[PDB]
Amino acid sequence: AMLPISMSDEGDSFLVKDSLGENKIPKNPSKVVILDLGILDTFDALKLNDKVVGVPAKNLPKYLQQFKNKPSVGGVQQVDFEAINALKPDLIIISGRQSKFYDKLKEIAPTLFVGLDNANFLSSFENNVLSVAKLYGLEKEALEKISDIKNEIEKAKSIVDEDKKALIILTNSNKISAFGPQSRFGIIHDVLGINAVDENIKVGTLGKSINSEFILEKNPDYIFVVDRNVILGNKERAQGILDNALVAKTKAAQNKKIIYLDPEYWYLASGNGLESLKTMILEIKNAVK
Ligand SMILES: O=C(NCCCCCNC(=O)c1cccc(O)c1O)c1cccc(O)c1O
Numbered sequence: 001a002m003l004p005i006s007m008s009d010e011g012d013s014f015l016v017k018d019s020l021g022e023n024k025i026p027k028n029p030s031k032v033v034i035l036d037l038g039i040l041d042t043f044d045a046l047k048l049n050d051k052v053v054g055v056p057a058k059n060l061p062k063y064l065q066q067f068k069n070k071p072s073v074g075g076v077q078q079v080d081f082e083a084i085n086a087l088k089p090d091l092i093i094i095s096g097r098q099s100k101f102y103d104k105l106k107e108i109a110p111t112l113f114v115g116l117d118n119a120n121f122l123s124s125f126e127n128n129v130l131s132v133a134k135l136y137g138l139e140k141e142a143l144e145k146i147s148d149i150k151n152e153i154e155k156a157k158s159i160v161d162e163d164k165k166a167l168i169i170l171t172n173s174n175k176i177s178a179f180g181p182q183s184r185f186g187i188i189h190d191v192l193g194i195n196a197v198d199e200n201i202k203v204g205t206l207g208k209s210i211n212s213e214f215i216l217e218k219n220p221d222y223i224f225v226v227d228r229n230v231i232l233g234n235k236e237r238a239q240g241i242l243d244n245a246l247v248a249k250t251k252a253a254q255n256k257k258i259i260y261l262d263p264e265y266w267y268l269a270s271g272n273g274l275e276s277l278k279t280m281i282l283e284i285k286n287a288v289k
């Protein structure tokens with residue numbers, strides 16, 4: 001299990017420890033640079049928009065356009081260090097895409113890691129949201145919105161067909177990769193209760209390389225597709241890649257249950273968002289119901 005964030009009070013500040021390090025964080029930070037898109041959505045949900053001073057405008061999705069005029073600190077992968085240091089932030093919030101920059105970010109300001117644990121999603125989620133809320137004295141408000149997400153998950157779980165099984169795939173250029181329980185798309189199986197076609201696909205951020213023959217051999221009832229081409233701006237599109245005779249023979253193809261999930265939520269990985277996680281839950285739910 002990834003280590004949780006832990007905090008202790010010290011008057012004007014908290015001493016915070018997370019899986020990457022220790023940081024003294026001031027209470028009520030007022031210049032926050034946010035590189036995790038989910039947490040950025042949680043700032044919105046908690047009415048903390050005016051605290052944010054930097055965002056990754058190169059990867060800002062459609063549901064986060066209230067932050068389009070914030071100063072840009074680049075993208076989720078192409079972090080602009082000069083821009084960040086010019087802002088003089090009091091806090092920088094990252095997730096797993098930026099852990100490789102942690103030392104460099106920590107020289108600028110205290111840097112909090114809000115990674116989602118792929119093997120312990122819901123527990124991680126709650127700890128990331130509550131830790132942020134504690135910085136601002138908003139635990140109460142955050143608890144109430146967490147309780148809303150939990151109720152949405154119960155509604156989604158309750159309509160799931162225990163007989164039926166699903167395969168999760170990612171399309172990049174023209175190649176296909178598969179993901180299963182405890183991967184970066186694990187919540188489909190782990191939280192929402194959808195049975196997997198193969199429990200033995202045991203993967204993290206990088207998927208198991210397969211072809212359509214595999215998909216047909218497994219004959220899933222649902223295929224959930226995340227198209228990485230949309231995010232990277234490639235020409236290739238999963239609808240094209242999956243239009244072939246082998247995929248056409250699956251029960252998923254025959255029942256219109258090939259589901260193209262929005263990659264601005266699933267791939268860009270906005271699960272730390274109090275509203276964005278809800279939208280993703282509903283998207284699974286309305287696809288299956
Ligand atoms: O460290 C990571 N990738 C290494 C670099 C790959 C280099 C190429 N990537 C892109 O152009 C890109 C752009 C936006 C979002 C992304 O996730 C991207 O991978 C990484 C970590 C967790 C999840 C990911 O998904 C990652 O990638």
Ligand SMILES: [Fe+3]
Pocket residue numbers: none
């Ligand atoms: Fe990536």
